[PDB]
């Protein structure tokens, strides 16, 4: 399988390198015949001879147009003839693109800023991370001597830890009596020992937590200070430090540097992103933090070195565990988007769709539009929000939740919403978005709706293959692919309003939201007027409904009957589904509610919880239980009165003191936010 691609220069000519792992062995394939190129749109084809002679200069080298070729492509749903201009080196493109654009006979230039190594994967139809190859992984972490008024990496590295299938170990230059600690004489010897470990283990993946902005930079500065050959690449190179935006990223040639930090930063939403908080959120297990002051104090003639070595060991161990949890998902994401795991794991959702579209555009001979210039970028201010019903406050019995299956992708497909179909003149059929009035041609399938349709079809083909796959490892992998297709399909709407997007269409985005608001509001009035349901609450693509004075099985039956009715009325791919049944449910405000199923599991959208005392969290759970399991509001009130009395009589442990503070600032605020809708103010208790 393909792990990554890059290029090196030999005699001024680019040489693509394809890093592979085939049949358990590392390989490097070279391609010396891939030519960089750009497209140029001309006002007259006779002008090609003048544009071929356009020159620029990169160093002492004169940059010329090597070869031109007339090509016929599709651009915004219309055929177009452009000239494919070839160059010697990919770095010639930024040097000459402006001179070619400024030529009077040139209307515009295209596909001039697609990185050479990524251009290669797309054009060759190559997909990284494809196959069943087993990748060897190794996580690592470092512990450093920190003092407040010092420069970066002024203090030495105290410990280097690593972890894999064999376990976790710590390399240090102080005598620590632990079985997993390897003692060396100096910091230099510790770094050298780490390099030998990586070289001998030869992992395909190096896993870190913030290694892009800390670990590698620290190791680099210390290796320069100590005169150590910091070679980690499989081809004898040092880690390459790159600038993506305001921060950094690190590549290790021949391997995949998998930094968990950017991945977890976009997967889960947490108040803090410390390694301890992220491990505790994913695995539900606590992890002790040992601060820089404690580590410095312990190192400077300290007995607590075993505690710091254990912290170092746990850093590598949890990094390996987290890497095992997120790597298979990123591998499937890489295979779906068609780019290396290194790029994919560091990319935003908007850029992931862009790479997917760039590949599909090449396969379909679709000329890609350019990224917005600085002027157009400033003009792309977001004007976006679905329908939110104000909830009917109070306690409700036997509530069903109905929602649309992929509402926004269904709208895009059904109404052919795309920049290439927007206000296109000359069609015999159009769909008009309500409120915003944008028209979309229906005669020809649009570029994006066509791909979105194939994504949904591919998702179903993957789901069927998953049910038939006996192999549990492959079943989990197919589960990732099917979930990733859903995520990618549900990213097209956001991509339409993504300011940096090539296929940007604010009109498309507004139209999807407007149609979405229409379908949800139409369905609500339909279930109220034709089935006598009460819609308690609704948000964007679904609603909670019930029949005041009806049995649980009666509500279920009429809900299924409504589904048969409205699904026959809904156009194209739009489909309403039965998501789940709830015995009880109370709706406080927009985005604040709580429901309970027949199993007695409570789902909450406004829970108050580690910067909150256990007494407040326990009372809240007791209140919710009384409301959702017993349906007794009078009991929920009594519980709070009981807890406040136990706190005031000093009968409650302080953590699990100022009795007035824990009543007025802890218990009451956490419980009032739930009992609020009933009219139970703080003065009501």
Author numbering: 1 to 383, 385 to 610, 613 to 659, 727 to 755
Give excerpts from the publication.
Archaeal DNA polymerases from the B-family (polB) have found essential applications in biotechnology. Variants of the archaeal polymerase from Thermococcus gorgonarius, TgoT, that can either generate HNA from DNA (TgoT_6G12) or DNA from HNA (TgoT_RT521) have been previously identified. In this study, six X-ray structures of DNA and HNA polymerases are reported: (i) three apo- structures of TgoT, TgoT_6G12, and TgoT_RT521-; (ii) two DNA-bound structures of TgoT_6G12 in binary and ternary complexes; and (iii) one DNA-bound structure of TgoT_6G12, which has incorporated two HNA nucleotides. Consistent with all other DNAPs from B-family, TgoT and its variants fold into five distinct structural subdomains.
In addition, another TgoT mutant capable of synthesizing complementary DNA from an HNA template was discovered. This mutant, named TgoT_RT521, is a reverse transcriptase that was engineered de novo. Compared to TgoT, this mutant has only two additional mutations, I521L and E664K. To better understand how the mutations added on TgoT variants impact the structure of the polymerase, the X-ray structures of the apo form of TgoT, replicative polymerase TgoT_6G12, and reverse transcriptase TgoT_RT521 were solved by crystallography. Crystals were obtained for the three polymerases and diffracted at 2.4, 3.1, and 2.35 Å, respectively. Comparison of TgoT_6G12 with TgoT_RT521 structures shows a strong similarity between the two polymerases (r.m.s. deviation for Cα atoms: 0.6 Å). The final apo TgoT_6G12 and TgoT_RT521 structures contained flexible segments in the thumb subdomains. Slight movements in the finger domain (r.m.s. deviation for Cα atoms: 1.18 Å for TgoT_RT521 and 1.1 Å for TgoT_6G12) and in the exonuclease domain (r.m.s. deviation for Cα atoms: 0.8 Å for TgoT_RT521 and 1.0 Å for TgoT_6G12) were observed for both mutants. On the contrary, larger rigid-body movements in the palm domains (r.m.s. deviation for Cα atoms: 2.7 Å for TgoT_RT521 and 2.3 Å for TgoT_6G12) were observed. For example, between amino acids 619 to 660, for TgoT_RT521, the r.m.s. deviation for Cα is 9.4 Å and between amino acids 619 and 650 for TgoT_6G12, it is 7.9 Å.
